[PDB]
Design a protein around this ligand. Structure first.
Ligand SMILES: Nc1nnc(N2CCC(Oc3nnc(NC(=O)Cc4ccccc4)s3)CC2)s1
Ligand SMILES: Nc1nnc(N2CCC(Oc3nnc(NC(=O)Cc4ccccc4)s3)CC2)s1
Lengths: 410, 410, 410, 409
């Protein structure tokens, strides 16, 4: 026996030849994209032989082995239906319907407090999925850059705990939600901001990362870190939204000065620089696709699903998922956790970074917000999704009524 | 082939016939108790044939065949290492280590608010486990009765939603936590109590179950309900603590009138009578073993794991597990959700009702309370337990660092 | 010289005789009512001689002397324009203008929570004046009885401090106002109700008066006390409004139990009896005339203006006038203290008990309330009144712009 | 009759000439200082004739007439015991006892947050009085300069209402006290600061004075105003404490931006410039004497008692006294209003600006603060004073038990 050969006959079909395009679409049906980083050596070997023998590019048992031996373990888990979602093909056709039904929630208002999000059309709407195994699906305007805005907070919280530990980080930031009419206070009674998902705690968390280097290097470190979380997919930066956030951040300076007087930053902090770093981190640009991979990184215990690298310590990813659950969706956090029960974080640009732990990561984007600051179509999508699949954090994996479970077969 | 025959060879060793005790301890090693209701027909036939021929109590292939013939499916998941916890034996010696570790947290104060909770010794400490498949382990004082006190709040919430639906119930009770600065208010900003786990919201929920019958039938309806959740193990009632709870409930009467004034009960409610039914529900008695079966019922999508009947609709168990997470441990709810991340509920008698969804239910019981009203040893046990097992709601089931996973084998 | 001789010539006209009506009309022009208690002996001696000599009916110097001998000190200070308001008659024609200007404020809502306050017509409106010297004026429906409701709180506070002292009384009740979204709390941070002018503190003050006797004796004592304060003018009681206050006082029972749980009553308090005494005290009845005398008792350092008896210790009246200033007009206290600056107290029946210290006491009564619970015309009158006279607590008695000062001559 | 002659015989005492010093101590015994501005023409004429004839300094009837003719109206109310406090001589010996009783309350902590108020010794303590008629008394360390700090807030409130009116001003600042549970918020429920006496409300009121001018003239405008309130007595400015307030006002800058975010300033306001003007107004310095004249100005319906000049409209002085009563002493405002019942304002330098309407104005000064920020000795003095005299806003002027009435004989 041999694994690459047994895999050859699984796809060879009993036939003696594999047309390689038949291999490529058998591959994409896994949901894996041809461009997957864990697959490069095999596509290197495929683009090589698509030149060597332009004569009927069918692969025999020996030549197929010559391309896929290097990636055979991941190719076989893909083809022996061992990924977290075995029938990915049907699942995307449910993701499509959920996308198209949220696509008719035309209500809401595009945040216009800056001219940069004000120029974004209300008709943009994209949903991107990446599972814990790297299966990909996207639908809508999923390659348009937009800023993370307030979706950056868990990402930077993760880095801070990843680099410094839970106990150090939470001397400066609380670990609970305020209370639905305490969105107006900055501090809890330990004179600590309530949690990293609000502007007060975000400004404090920003204060802890890479102390002692300048703001240019600090930003560099976060970009390198956010690069690994998305498996080197698109991470960018909008200078335009940066300047309009620095000229308009009256409430943020208010928070900085309040935090400075009440001695909530670590020793030797330059408060006004931290606010400039903060406005920077909120105009890091993503797409629906790249950011869905970062979301899958947290769904996966801190291991990037399309590269296999350890990017965050499991302690950092649990804390962040805990704190997204409670505090992630403004005054809709409490109701969102009850009805949807998925760690999620929203942003002023209309993004929702969603995690379904041990299944998949996601990013939704439609600019128009509802009156609580959450993307209209984005929020409508996350309801239908939990309505449909037993992904609610406190669903039962065995008895779950008329819901669907994508992690099983028949 | 056929099922009773193949298992026979697994236990037979290739020997003879199986000595009946060798079958029994092989059975108990799964963690099932001989008393399991799903096993009654099989133990009835073994006690019969242990009479039919008293010389030579060993079972050949045909005699074993018709003793386990009726319960063969559950016997096979038991013997084929298919229960949710395969090595129950090693795991229980981990529960014992955790138990003996919390047993040295001698601090705290036994609630003295009535002479009935004061009558409990501080060195009582019991932990009882019930998995979603019915494997059991107990350690410590797990047969001593005590009242649920506030551990009854999610149970009646579940019953209320099970009978009435999410939409009706949450017209009278909110679904979020107060906020560590609203632990003293009764009503949230819609003049609904904040959630079913606070005394105000509990009292409101009590006003909803089985409206229109008298308090005697109402009690019967809730007790019959709790009997199915505990698979008919001990569910009792302390009249003694009841008399002390009704004479000392000034704050509850205080809550009762305020709710009446602001019309938070359903029409035709007898407020002062609803307050008696409430005091009753707080002195229903359990032991650690009986109540751990109640907790496993919620871990199990609403199916009693040791009897198999459906007791609660998945909507009832999800909502209840959502709100135990957020609002379950008094003002320690936030830290508990962050650090332990498991649905749980405490009571002033020293109970902690714990749920690890899709795995097991638990009840920890030591009377001495800490400074927030949560049992000292209970809270220490529930910290160590998540430190040890990847049970924190947001652990990753694939990458979980040096934690143990009892759901996996070698 | 001799005083009664001096006074005869002031009225005598240079003439022989003074006709008896000419004395009476000279008397009422002082503003004193002939029925004044400090005048009884003189009108007694007048009704004596209106029989002795039915044909006169003029008094010579020896006979005028025989009627005014007994009351001469008070009669001349009246006639030598030594009363606090020298030209009382012109002053009453300004009170008439103020009354007639508020009488065109037709808005507001009559409190309907009990059927007894709902039966009062919205077109009832009365203003009654009694100065620190006993000059009286009334305009409108000033002899219609109505309940004090919440106007009773200072009256009983005065009695409590009068009998027990500031230091004892204020172990149970604060001395400050809450804060304008804290109309909803019961206790301040020291577990004391905030001040005697809110229902929580009122109920507690009610617990201090005449401890150790039953509720019938306790009420009797307060009636005897309110009797001296109104100089034996009309104080009555509506059992009707009492019965609807006890059947509808859910918030007060709510407050009663909260206070009992937090141990805010004095030892040996029967909580439920205290609430019954409280409902009684709010259904004491007055008219505009009768109650304005109580207000003058507070305007006069604790001495009843129409009897001269010391009824309250000066400590009792300052405290009460202090707390009426801060806390007297529901959420309108702050606005009322700024713009009107007079110690005042309102009630849900539409009463306003007003004090201009060292000048006069008042009672306004119109049933229709504004949106904060204060009678429309009562509030409109008190604005117009302070607009007109330098009566605002922080007016200057020497430089007061274009305002009128009724205590001066020309 | 003749006004000047009638006085001559009252002090002449049956004699033919009045020794000029005998006139002088009879003058000062009313409590007037010879330095009174309303008396200048009369003292000018006295030292002139004290030169014209260095010959036996006694005054006959016709020469006395020519000295006080110009100021005779004020001299007669002084000598016919018609001032608001007739026996000023006995009363000041009550102020002295009250002073020496507060002087032994050694508790409290001198504010140390800037090295400039930390530079003040805790044993400094001074009480200065000014009546509505100009009678003066001082005792203790009453000529030591110190900054008004938060004692300036009602002064600038008054100036804003005097210049703008109650209604305009209170579109930006509330009129009630927070509530002993709202000492940490900036805004009340209408997104307006609670009242002019808190840092948030003061900062906004500061935003209303003399809009459209630069900060240099704005200061000039406020100073000219404070000079008239003190009758041109000492009003200064500490640059030293100013620089330290600009470096350490993190919480004030915190208030500035929050107010900017919530649109609580008038249009075209430069917030950060307003904050420097604010720190400027908070380190204007007074002595106990000069500022005691400011307090009497508010006691006097807006007329400076020692010059006769109208400085504030009665609308501005009433509002300022209403709000001093309610909101004037940090978290002690409630108890202070109950037990003392007098308009007052404190500052972190150890000042208490006190007003007894229609009687007198005052300034107490001892640096060490109690835990609420109010001078220890000052609060002890203001209690003792009201225990003694029926000045409590709601004492009764007719029946007041064992208290004194200095307005009586
Ligand atoms: N009308 C308005 N809206 N929002 C307003 N703000 C309120 C003041 C803010 O500064 C502070 N915020 N919370 C503070 N509270 C604490 O630190 C201790 C603490 C005590 C009790 C409970 C929770 C914590 S202090 C700025 C924004 S004011
Ligand atoms: N939405 C709603 N409106 N009204 C509601 N109430 C129901 C229950 C409430 O009980 C209490 N009232 N005041 C309390 N305050 C204290 O004990 C001391 C204290 C500590 C710290 C800071 C302030 C004060 S506790 C009464 C009103 S709930």
């Amino acid at each position: 026996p041999s694994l690459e050969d047994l895999l050859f006959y699984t796809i060879a079909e009993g036939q003696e030849k594999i047309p390689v395009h038949k291999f490529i679409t058998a591959l994409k049906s896994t949901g894996l994209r041809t461009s997957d980083p864990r697959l490069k050596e095999c596509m290197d070997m495929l683009r090589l032989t698509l030149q060597t023998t332009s004569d009927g590019v069918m692969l025999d048992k020996d030549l197929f082995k010559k391309c896929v031996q290097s990636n055979i373990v991941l190719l076989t888990q893909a083809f022996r239906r061992k990924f977290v979602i075995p029938d990915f093909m049907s699942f995307t056709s449910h993701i499509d319907e959920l996308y198209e039904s949220a696509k008719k929630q035309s209500g809401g208002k595009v945040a216009d407090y800056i001219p940069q999000l004000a120029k974004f059309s209300p008709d943009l709407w994209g949903v991107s999925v990446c599972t814990a195994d790297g299966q990909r699906h996207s639908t809508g305007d999923t390659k348009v850059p937009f800023c993370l805005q307030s979706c950056v907070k868990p990402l930077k919280y993760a880095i801070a705990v990843n680099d410094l530990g839970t106990e150090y980080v939470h001397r400066y930031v609380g670990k609970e939600p305020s209370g639905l009419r305490f969105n107006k206070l900055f501090l809890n009674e330990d004179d600590k901001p309530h949690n990293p998902m609000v502007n007060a705690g975000a400004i404090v968390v920003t204060s802890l990362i890479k102390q002692g280097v300048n703001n240019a290097e600090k930003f560099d470190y976060v970009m390198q870190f956010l690069n690994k979380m998305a498996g080197n997919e698109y991470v960018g930066f909008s200078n335009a939204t940066f300047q309009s956030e620095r000229e308009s951040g009256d409430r943020n300076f208010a928070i900085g000065y309040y935090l400075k007087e009440k001695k909530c930053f670590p020793e030797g902090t330059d408060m006004v620089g931290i606010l400039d770093f903060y406005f920077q981190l909120c105009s890091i640009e993503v797409t629906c696709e790249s950011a869905s991979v970062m979301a899958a990184t947290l769904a996966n215990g801190g291991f990037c699903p399309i590269t296999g690298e350890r990017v965050l310590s499991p302690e950092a990813v649990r804390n962040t998922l805990s704190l997204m659950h409670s505090c992630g969706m403004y005054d809709f956090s409490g109701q969102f956790a009850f009805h949807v029960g998925l760690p999620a974080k929203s942003g002023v640009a209309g993004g929702i970074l969603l995690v379904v732990p041990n299944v998949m990561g996601m990013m939704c984007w439609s600019p128009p917000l509802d009156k609580m600051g959450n993307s209209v179509k984005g929020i409508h999508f996350c309801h239908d999704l939990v309505s449909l699949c037993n992904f609610h954090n406190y669903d039962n994996l065995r008895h779950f009524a008329k819901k669907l479970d994508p992690r099983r077969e028949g």
